[PDB]
């Protein structure tokens, strides 16, 4: 459970306000609560091959919630299903039961999310159900690339390998697809600070 600041290792409550940014008020580190990579202010990123240095950003692995939050729950579910990882669709105007950080820290009672709870999202709202799915995905180290289209695979290859890939002479789309995926998985690890098992 919880969020550890990757710099000073102070433990925080696993409490994401719909946002991946986390600021350690102990040591002032700024990092992604999804992959524990540093966040950088504009022009501050010290990575020499960074192509977005003028932007406020961090560098995320492809299985960070930063990215996978943008998937549909259906597709996330597909990744889990394909790997025989079980998840809830049902709970065991109340709204989402995830308890968030209280607006008043010394408050007595917990504050539930309360948001709309889609049918089949296990009594969670959309964002929280997705976060749940991704925690399962990350826990079992599932590779989202396994479900990429060729376009996604090209994106990923440029992003993580810094090469623009192109089909070979007489390479069909399936063969091209499998070639990009093979190299991606072979050369680019999943999140290295994402908690596993
Ligand atoms: C002060 N500060 C905040 C940030 C920061 C950087 C990134 C994100 C992020 O989650 O991407 C956030 C969280 C707040 C935010 O702007 C935000 C967002 F940009 C996108 C999303 C989002 C995108 N898809 N689904 C949700 C949610 C957010 F809360 C905040 C950096 N500095
Ligand atoms: Cl919100
Ligand atoms: Cl990607
Ligand atoms: Cl990483
Ligand atoms: Zn810290
Ligand atoms: Zn991240
Ligand atoms: Zn950068
Ligand atoms: Zn919720």
Numbering used by the authors: 867 to 958, 966 to 1070
Paper text:
The ubiquitin system, composed of ubiquitin-activating enzyme (E1), ubiquitin-conjugating enzyme (E2), and ubiquitin ligase (E3), regulates numerous cellular functions through the generation of various ubiquitin chains in a system referred to as the ubiquitin code. HOIP, as well as HOIL-1L, belongs to the RBR-type E3 family, and the family E3s reportedly generate polyubiquitin chains through a RING-HECT-hybrid reaction. Among them, HOIP contains the E3 active site.
Furthermore, we developed seven derivatives of HOIPIN-1, and found that HOIPIN-8 is the most potent LUBAC inhibitor among them. HOIPINs are covalently attached to the catalytic Cys885 of HOIP via Michael addition. The benzoate moiety of HOIPINs is the key element for binding to HOIP. The carboxyl group of the benzoate hydrogen bonds with Arg935, and the aromatic ring of the benzoate hydrophobically interacts with Phe905, Leu922, and the aliphatic portion of His887. Furthermore, the two pyrazol moieties of HOIPIN-8 form additional interactions with HOIP that enhance the affinity. The benzoate, 2,6-difluorophenyl, and 1H-pyrazol-4-yl moieties of HOIPIN-8 interact with Arg935 and Asp936, which are located in the LDD domain of HOIP. Arg935 and Asp936 in the LDD domain reportedly interact with Glu16 and Thr14 in the acceptor ubiquitin, and the Ala mutations of these residues abrogated the linear ubiquitination activity. Thus, HOIPIN-8 not only interacts with the active Cys885 but also masks the critical residues for acceptor ubiquitin-binding.
